[PDB]
């Protein structure tokens, strides 16, 4: 009988101008848990411009060269644990 | 600044599994600690008790428990510019 | 007390094929050691010893008749064993 | 035999944030699993809730929450032989 | 969530070494993957070839090569809440 | 897939230790995340409270607590290709 994984620090919303970078972070209740990030409900492919990072209880997503079409919900799920927040891309 | 592309050193290979059995896939990259993404039939896979995604140094492993007929198709993996694919054949015994 | 959450399970393989064992512990990053027939296992191309979080994995490639026997694992205080059966096709 | 020196592959670049927001810095090394040290205005950074030091593979990240005008200055990183610096500007 | 503070499961022990020799310190925390900082005589340690900072799961290690007499003093470690200290004594033959 | 063999970059050094104290061995390989095996007098080490096996990037470390006279002899490490050996010398104060 083991505890389900929980979100200790949820995702916060990010604002970013076109071409700049957005960073998201979430902290889980326990280290080394596997999860998956989505943007506007579509799973993210890792790329030079989309970097998926894990370090202990922390999960980080780095989105470089953000574009207007990217505005919408960023979400993360690792088993039971789920969090979501808004990404707003602005022009100047 | 001069860095080698990530390459596949040992590629995915095909597996045949009977229904209800588990299948495992593995690939070895040229560099350790490279983030990898797995897909089955073109759909990105997420970790769960029956779909375990494993990373250890240069090795990437996918374990699929309780395989079902409808899972037959291409398993693919991508890590940086490194890509590999092989077939999952589930047989009805 | 570090516990075993999902124990080793037995596996059957044909000669030449690969066998995989797996165990899930209650805690991640615990140093694990594997044995086959009571003999400690070193990593090699045909014997791959994997750790990722709570999961420990042993992959045995090109299995041979003489390898039939008990596969066992220990991490801190937790122990688990199961059988490898290699058979001719 | 010959071992390559660790190099900076993707250097630190400057970040500008407004007072009270968080700034994220990012550097990529030529090799994974290299132990790195961060500094802000020449002082070694101590990991905290507001000051998070992250490593994953070739990637090293520094997150500074609730930035203050007094924190404007040079952020530097060093790992083995590799060094990078960029500016944190907290904007009024 | 409601999380336990990091604790010290096994504290630093004192080390004594002759000059030129290496000292090794070891502390075990209650949780793996916790980030910490080492200090020597109250000063943050920079990680040269002679000063190696190591982490593996719940264990944190400091290796100091080529110890000199000036290094005699308190070695401390801090990871969030968790803190420990022990004496380094450097002796002349 | 055209890959370099793992090599020892920093070999094991010999350690002298008094009875009851702890000995610390370290070796550095040419690549991080390589799996290896430690031996004492040609016998594989079983990890225990007094026998700790540590990995961190290119570094491999062995910690032997509460050293006893009978433990004197060769300590070795091998990672596939790579092998290094050094002497453990336990003495009475
Ligand atoms: Zn940011
Ligand atoms: Zn971990
Ligand atoms: Zn970390
Ligand atoms: Zn980046
Ligand atoms: Zn416009
Ligand atoms: Zn090539
Ligand atoms: Zn990753
Ligand atoms: Zn499984
Ligand atoms: Zn490993
Ligand atoms: Zn219990
Ligand atoms: Zn249980
Ligand atoms: Zn398998
Ligand atoms: Zn280990
Ligand atoms: Zn393999
Ligand atoms: Zn993992
Ligand atoms: Zn060399
Ligand atoms: Zn480190
Ligand atoms: Zn944070
Ligand atoms: Zn020592
Ligand atoms: Zn050293
Ligand atoms: Zn290399
Ligand atoms: Zn690594
Ligand atoms: Zn110890
Ligand atoms: Zn490390």
Author numbering:
A (entry chain A): -2 to 89
B (entry chain D), E (entry chain F), F (entry chain C): -3 to 89
C (entry chain B): 1 to 89
D (entry chain E): -3 to 88
Tell me what the authors wrote about this structure, in their words.
We apply the force distribution analysis to I27, an IG domain of the muscle protein titin and one of the most robust protein domains known. We have determined the first high-resolution crystal structure of I27, a cornerstone for the interpretation of force spectroscopy experiments and crucial for our analysis. We present here the first force distribution network in a protein at atomic detail, thereby revealing the force-bearing scaffold rendering I27 mechanically robust. The A'G strand, known to be crucial for mechanical resistance, forms a mechanical clamp.
There are six I27 molecules in the asymmetric unit arranged around the local non-crystallographic 6-fold axis, with the N-termini of I27 closest to the local axis and the C-termini pointing outward. The entire amino acid sequence from residue 1–89 is visible in electron density (except L89 in chain E), as well as an additional 3–4 residues left from the TEV cleavage site after the N-terminal H6-tag (-AMA- in chain A; none in chain B; and -GAMA- in chains C–F, see Methods). As a comparison, the RMSD between non-crystallographic symmetry-related chains in the I27 crystal structure ranges from 0.16–0.35Å. The present crystal structure of I27 represents an improved model for further studies because it does not contain potential structural perturbations introduced by unwanted mutations, and due to the high quality diffraction data, with overall coordinate error of 0.15Å. Overall, there are more and shorter H-bonds in the crystal structure comparing to the previously described NMR structure. An additional H-bond between E3 and S26 and a stronger bond between K6 and E24 are found between strands A and B. While the hydrogen bonding between the A' and G strand largely overlaps, the interaction between Y9-N83 is absent but E12-K87 are within interaction distance, the latter supposedly adding resistance. Of the two residues mutated in the NMR structure, T78 (first residue of strand G) makes a side chain H-bond interaction with the carbonyl oxygen of L2 (preceding strand A) which is absent in the NMR structure and which could potentially add further mechanical resistance to I27. A number of structural features, such as the A'G interstrand hydrogen bonds or the interactions involving T78, which was absent in the NMR structure due to the T78A mutation, are part of the force-bearing network. The determination of a refined crystal structure thus served as an important basis for our force distribution analysis.
